[PDB]
Write a protein that binds this ligand. Sequence first.
Ligand code: B0M
Ligand code: NI
Length: 341
Amino acid sequence: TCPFYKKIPGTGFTVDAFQYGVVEGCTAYFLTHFHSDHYAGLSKHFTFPVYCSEITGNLLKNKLHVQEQYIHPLPLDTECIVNGVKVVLLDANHCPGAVMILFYLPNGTVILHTGDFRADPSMERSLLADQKVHMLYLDTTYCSPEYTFPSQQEVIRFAINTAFEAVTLNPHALVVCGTYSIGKEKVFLAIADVLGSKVGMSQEKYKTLQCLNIPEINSLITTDMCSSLVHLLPMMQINFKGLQSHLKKCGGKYNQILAFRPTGWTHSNKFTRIADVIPQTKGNISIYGIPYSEHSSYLEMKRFVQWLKPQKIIPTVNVGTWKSRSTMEKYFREWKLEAGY
Ligand SMILES: CN1CCN(C(=O)c2ccc3cc[nH]c3c2)CC1
Ligand code: NI
């Protein structure tokens, strides 16, 4: 059964609701982004209209084999009419193709669904600018003040400088970056760029990246592993055993591995600054966990909501426990009282 927080009232619409069979009364299914918790259920056999961004539509067609006749891509920042209701897609600052959705209900109510997002001040100058929003369906992933992390720019600076130092000291070092979904591409692209290398990867991962409309991508990625000194592997292989195994396969080209795991928040954010981060090392392998987030920090989320001043907030993450729900509700009230809405 489809949960209430995936339904848009006064419409025939659901958001990220593909794992519940045929949802009674749903005339159009929206998909915010191509992450598996959100697309779970879509396949070549899906025969209802799916509304999404162009990038998301490319991934549906080529990775899930959804038939073209049911994929309805919409341009960003453009008023569109869907089944008699005005909608707008906005960039979510999450992974490639991820959007927020504005719904203008026939009765005058305005609803913003953030999908997954990393709130940014730049959103305060989109089409949201002087738009009254009555209901906000909010990505509350990190809705607690302990969740701090650096800017994406600071984390990339650390990664570039770390990789460049290591490989300039040892030209026979290989760099490895973990991945398990789309998103966080800047990590491996920025490192390859500083090293003057293409990024080497599996055919399956290459296929995925070719769907993302990234400028000059043919110049940056390859399936020829032998030509590359930056390799991408599944996140599950980024451990001492898995990396030792990989090094064996490279045929004595390399004698050291520097590897990166781009996590979200971890407990070491409560203690350490990005400049001070150190790896776990065993012999000729080192592994850095770097806090590259594609979700709002607590402070970023707070600033967005206090700027927007919604009348009602509906959380879409951490909704399964009474303790989480009570904690989030207490922060929303704090934010409202501080800002005066
Ligand atoms: C930053 N943002 C906050 C929310 N917001 C309103 O609540 C609002 C109030 C009054 C009018 C009158 C026309 N449009 C309006 C929008 C728009 C500005
Ligand atoms: Ni996501």
